[PDB]
Amino acid sequence: MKQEVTRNHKKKDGEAWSLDDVVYSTTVKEREKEKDIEQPPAEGV
């Protein structure tokens, strides 16, 4: 997953993302149901 996101963020800027100098960003969905999630995230798992 860490590769997949950094390959998307090579064009983005500014700064070009390497696997050197990237770390995980983690948030908890806090949703009443798990089936409210219909599509995957943009950059996520």
Next chain:
Amino acid sequence: PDYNDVEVRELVSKLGGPNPKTSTERGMTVPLNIFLYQEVTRMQRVIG
């Protein structure tokens, strides 16, 4: 049922990438599709 290695590789070659609408990339070259192939081959090794 036991996974056929030559079949699995044909199913893996068909796998898309993340953001699969605009990505237009497929197969073992995609970081999670190489990973899937590795853990499917490790799962068959266990099943066997």
